[PDB]
Write a protein that binds this ligand. Structure first.
Ligand SMILES: NC(=O)c1ccc[n+]([C@@H]2O[C@H](COP(=O)([O-])OP(=O)(O)OC[C@H]3O[C@@H](n4cnc5c(N)ncnc54)[C@H](OP(=O)(O)O)[C@@H]3O)[C@@H](O)[C@H]2O)c1
Ligand SMILES: Nc1nc(=O)c2nc(CNc3ccc(C(=O)N[C@@H](CCC(=O)O)C(=O)O)cc3)cnc2[nH]1
Length: 160
């Protein structure tokens, strides 16, 4: 099973200069809660943006690099390998970046979208998709506080 998790702004922005466009600590805490217990699948630039493997998850990096360059991870060279690893009932989380979200979109079963109601500047976007193909299963407004000073919400869609 393939689930996506991502945070995007009102213009579908996810990144700028190989980095996040904002700081939203409660959303990162949510990401940790959701992805705990699961293999996480990421592109090489997303791994480097994170900087070190995330704890308590199998970190799978899609890259042409040798395995030796990402020893704290499991390297695969093709998304075919991702589908083989992820086939069946056990849930993989695809954690970006734009290239994986776009190319793996037809194979996603679930979308865990943090929607930030703001427009930032940047250079990487989540792919357009027709929301009419999806059911909104859950929605929760994110805490707006001093550390998390946006209007944001945690949405989960499941494919029809
Ligand atoms: N807001 C969010 O939720 C969120 C989530 C994740 C990432 N981001 C942001 O997104 C940006 C990164 O996204 P991106 O699209 O530039 O990079 P990316 O998808 O993370 O990484 C691209 C690299 O991954 C490898 N790759 C990707 N698809 C491949 C495929 N099918 N087969 C083989 N290799 C493949 C290649 O590595 P090699 O060149 O090594 O072969 C490619 O150069 C950063 O700004 C990051 O902060 C945001
Ligand atoms: N909802 C969501 N928000 C994001 O910002 C996001 N970012 C990525 C890629 N970038 C990152 C950057 C940092 C961490 C990170 O440090 N996560 C820790 C957070 C621990 C905490 O803050 O409590 C982790 O253990 O998951 C994860 C992904 C992928 N999916 C996302 N999904």
């Amino acid at each position: 099973m393939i689930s996506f998790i991502f945070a995007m702004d009102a213009n579908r922005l996810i990144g700028k200069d190989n980095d996040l466009p904002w700081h939203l600590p409660n959303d990162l805490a949510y990401f940790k809660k959701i992805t705990s217990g699961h293999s996480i699948i990421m592109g090489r630039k997303t791994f480097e943006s994170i900087g070190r493997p995330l704890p308590n998850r199998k970190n799978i990096v899609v890259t042409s690099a040798p395995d030796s360059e990402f020893q704290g991870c499991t390297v695969v060279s093709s998304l075919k390998d991702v589908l083989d690893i992820c086939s069946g009932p056990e849930e993989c989380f695809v954690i970006g970046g734009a290239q994986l979200y776009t190319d793996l979109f037809p194979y996603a079963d679930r979308l865990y979208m943090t929607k930030i109601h703001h427009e930032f500047e940047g250079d990487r976007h989540f792919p357009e998709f027709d929301e009419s193909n999806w059911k909104l299963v859950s929605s929760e407004q994110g805490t707006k506080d001093e550390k998390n000073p946006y209007d944001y919400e945690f949405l989960m869609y499941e494919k029809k």
